[model samples]
Target: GMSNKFLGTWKLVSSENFDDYMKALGVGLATRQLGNLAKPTVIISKKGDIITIRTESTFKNTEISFKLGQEFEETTADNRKTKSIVTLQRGSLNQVQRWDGKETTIKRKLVNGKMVAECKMKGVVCTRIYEKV
Candidate 1:
């Protein structure tokens, strides 16, 4: 397979099953509704080795700053979502995420036409999936 550049600011063009995505995350109805109507804006900026991704929705906004192949602080809205030691390895995406104080190695991979990641921590297996537009 070829590779995805994944370097532009992609507006939320459309979604196949975003509600299912949030459902997989166990987000509440309110949060899911907001997320559905979020009009998410994603902007990824890379300068040499440093990479910064900013996502903004109608009800929430998040920023994840990291260096390729290096770990950094990732904080999300309301502090409920957080991660550390997240590194984008291999390919243009290839985000290896070990989060929650590095308790587990939850890795993310682009597969089955979807960006998928899953791992167990605190007795709860959390997973997320995204597609590039």
Candidate 2:
């Protein structure tokens, strides 16, 4: 069973190495600038077996909902259309996105009472931390 520990609203507190991670995803300069400046809020909720992850920020808002292990189509904040899948592994929510032969992975987990997100693409890795709100 999926734990309810992740179901809550969280506010971004810090981010590191995000620009290079976005660059690896081919995000344009304008979008990358905005992305670097935006500190987003994240909401996690679940209904039945479907989990929803929502992100809100001054620059953009996006959301995804799916059951664990199900594959779905997703349009990223940078507007890349991707085939995506999310799975729960060892208490972490792991997401994988693929587009145009490119791939990225994002892992979200709780660390020291904070929500930590690790985003990776090419050889770059970005770490973002969030506090429960």
Instruction: Please report the candidate that would top lDDT against the real structure.
Output: 2
Cα deviation of 69, candidate 2, in Å: 0.3
lDDT of 2 by residue, 82-113 (tens): 99999888899999999898899999998888
- The superposed Cα distance between candidate 2 and the true structure at residue 128, in angstroms, equals 0.4
Candidate 1 lDDT, tens digit per residue, 1-133? 1134455555654454556655544568988787777666666677766676777776888877776556665554534444465554564254433344434444545566554545444455545555565
lDDT of 1 at 101: 47
* Clash list (residue pairs), candidate 1: none
User: Stretches of candidate 1 above 4 Å error?
Assistant: 1-5, 85-90, 96-133
lDDT of 2 at 122: 83
Compared with the true structure, model 1 gives a TM-score of 0.60
lDDT to native, each model = 0.57, 0.92
